[model samples]
Target chain A: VTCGQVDANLAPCVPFLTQGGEPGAACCSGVKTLNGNAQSPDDRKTACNCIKAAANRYPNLKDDAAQSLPSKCGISLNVPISRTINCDTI
Target chain B: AVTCGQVDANLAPCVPFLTQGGEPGAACCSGVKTLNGNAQSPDDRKTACNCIKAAANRYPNLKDDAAQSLPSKCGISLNVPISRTINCDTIS
Candidate 1:
């Protein structure tokens, strides 16, 4: 079973990390510090910001598809936050 | 415009007279003596009865369909009784 390489968020990101992979330093940085400890809305926003900021560096990262990662992360990052947060906003 | 025999209810024959080389006489008897005047429903029964009687020579002096003469003297008759009269025993 190929373990998924997604950050704390469930958005898929293995496409940028394979052999001959041109995975950007930003992409590596995005998942590096995901300690799964985003306990507040601000922490979730920060984690999602870090993942998005790093993921944005890869030219092949489909913005819409990659954005799902941050969105998922944001959901996990802020569990106690209001459920009304618009998932489409990411 | 050939002149032909005609039957009238008011005349001696209650049925119409049919003639040859003329309009069929049965029409006259059928029209005048039909129990009911209407073409549909009970009236039609009268028409059917009159038609059978006229053609069959059931009545006295009523001419049957003869080879040479227009059967029944070619009389054209018309009955005015409404369909409701068909159930009545008489045409009064």
Candidate 2:
């Protein structure tokens, strides 16, 4: 049922992950869509794991800035978005 | 700039699909996009590695190929080993 977690689906949001400019409208939409939809605990963990894995791979993924995007955009998740998140417990 | 919470928020929509299927859905691919765009410094990159590694550990035997191919399958790219055994802190 969940859609858009693939590389292709989320590629539009990548540019915002760096030390670059603000995230675009499309990226914001993607973020909101994913947040509003995932409804279960396991489901949440999966997405959590997915992004955690993917974001780290980014060649230029910044720390404070990356962490700031959520607050900047006024988004919050059940899990902490820090660079040291413990996925094992999720 | 990003957080696992946001990463999770973007990726949760993909769990049902990625947990039991072929290449993840478009949304799954799309989730990483926001991350594609920072290297403020090596420390930041290193932090990203540790974060990615934590997530990678969650899927034990999803297998090496699974992890390795995940990024490539979507025409995306990641610089680490993609292995559960991999230590993001040490990667160069």
Candidate 3:
């Protein structure tokens, strides 16, 4: 089985497939794949956290980043221990 | 010579014309071009205003319909005559 991909509102987060054979369009479009090796989780998390914060900044988010991002993407904690989470509520 | 495109934190707004031909990359990415005789100001304003309002909604979580739109696009009449203005000093 292949895992879904992710997309980000801010900068691009390219994914690297581990369990999944190849990424599907939904998975690709859904989540941003990361280069965990070259880019540390802290660095990636910084960008992710920034985007999450920006999304959370707005009351409406119609034009806000959070509103623009996928709900599923928010839930997907790229981290192993789940230190941070994405748009969980909406 | 070309005028610098106005940058906003919302959707695309197209710009037209230059002294010469061939659209530049900056111009292409700068704004969304419109087709004349195809769209109306009210219609365009509606979308633009919606985007603006969506941007305004503070929660950052938006529904399909619920979102804050832009202030300038809403036709709210920002600079009105002094008589029509509402002067409320809530800071007291």
Candidate 4:
């Protein structure tokens, strides 16, 4: 459930990652959904690992886009989506 | 003649380096170098870039620097920009 929900929450950001375009409405909504669901440390960690797994999958994902995703969505994550990230930092 | 599957296969062994944040495996370095050797032409480079992007889009938590470092870590460089904000369409 957590993985799937996380997947769904991030689907909207795909275009931004793939194309280096801007985030739109759906992407922001996803940020809200996932961010809101991450209500606890454990829940937050689950989300972190989920995003880590997904990010680990991409061979061609972007940097500025990744760093900007949370801010663009107007959301704050327990874990920063940054390349210099410590996944467990959250 | 590089196939998308080939690109994926080459990068398959590099996943652990990304998630855990550590030194890359020989196989991972091998994959990076192998792809570097194969991706020669302008068109091939674009295809490779898109292929890498396609693979990366699946993960939302991958560190962009880690992905970027895979090239240099193996003593290789691509004609395309692997930066997180680079547009694949414009690479060629």
Candidate 5:
């Protein structure tokens, strides 16, 4: 998957990531979609890189908010979302 | 001399660059420069600003930084900041 698709899927999660609040339906759905779409290792790595890029871009992104995304949305990714995440490791 | 419809059409090409981090295509810069030229008056500028905000709302992928960089990237000036949170009403 390209970074463009990754960005589109995670776009709805930006607000929840930056602000402390329950993730909305759209946000959770996007998370779930990304989990489903990124079946391959390369795809997961791409998603991880894109998520890291966004987290770094928005200074307001709460660490806890990002950490809670997988569980809060009931979706699991190959790698956790974090600003310091090494996408290559994923 | 600008309308929301015109503004939408002009800036549509910028979506790819705004969402995905990459060099804004020639079409995207052309559209941006063209839109800036279209909005000559304060009222038209405000109209264009409001229109852009509406479009941004629809597409969550539009990056804040990317939108803000459009004017400088295209070598044009705008009265309104190209941001989702911008108060378009205050463009004047």
Candidate 6:
């Protein structure tokens, strides 16, 4: 999938991670969509790279918020959200 | 005659579409038109290319397919490829 597609899927999660709040339905929906979208290892790697790139855009992204997002949103991500994740490994 | 700021401002509207699949909207095409109009000379083209290259580096969320398709979608021809790993120095 394209980075644009990936970004669109994860856009909702941005605000929740950058600001401070529980992930809304939209965010959860996005998480769920992205989870299924990137199923293959290549797709997951691309998604991981895109997610890291998007995450870096916000300087105020709360680590606590990010770490909790997957669990809170009830979705499973192949890679944990972090500013310094190794996308190659995904 | 154009600065990176103007180039960045003109192209900023494209970010959403570049990172997310959808129509680029009027504003994005307008920006593309303006950018094309402003960068006439070789130097200006190179400068604009450099600016876009730096922006692509700063934000890796830019999708290659989206970026490549934008020029055609906006009905514009660009000397440089709108990509994350474009060689700006080759523009001119």
Which one is best on DockQ?
Answer: 2
Off by over 4 Å in 6: B1-92
iRMSD value for model 2: 10.3
Model 3 is docked with a DockQ of 0.02
lDDT of 2 at A60: 77
Looking at candidate 3 chain A, the ten consecutive residues that score lowest on lDDT are A1-10
Candidate that beats the other on TM-score, 2 or 5, i.e. the better one: 5
Task: TM-score each candidate.
Answer: 0.22, 0.46, 0.20, 0.47, 0.48, 0.50
Error of 5 at B45 (Å): 1.0
Model 3, range B22-49, lDDT digits (tens) per residue? Answer: 2323433233222111113433332222
DockQ of each: 0.00, 0.06, 0.02, 0.02, 0.02, 0.02
lDDT of 3: 0.26
Candidate 1: where is the Cα deviation over 4 Å? A1-35, A67-90, B1-92
What is the docking quality class of candidate 2?
A: incorrect
Which window of 10 residues has the lowest lDDT sum in candidate 4 chain B? B80-89
Window of ten residues with lowest summed lDDT in model 6 chain A: A1-10
Error of 3 at A30 (Å): 6.4
Compare candidates 5 and 6 on lDDT and give the better one. Answer: 6
B4-85: candidate 4 lDDT, tens digit per residue: 4566688888878765667789998888878778777765665566556645654557777788777677666655555445
Q: What is residue B24's positional error in candidate 4, in angstroms?
A: 1.1
Query: Which CAPRI tier for candidate 5?
Result: incorrect
What is the C-alpha lDDT profile of model 2 across B1-92, one tens digit per residue? 43445444554544544445467668766765544443234444444444455555554344455556666776777543445556444666
Model 6 Cα displacement at B41 (Å)?
Answer: 25
lDDT of 5 by residue, A1-90 (tens): 443455677788888888969888998887778788667765565456555655666658899988888888887666576867755466
Error of 5 at B33 (Å): 1.1
lDDT of 1 by residue, A1-90 (tens): 000122323232446422223434454344433434444443443333333323433445554444343344343333222212221132
Candidate order, TM-score descending? 6, 5, 4, 2, 1, 3
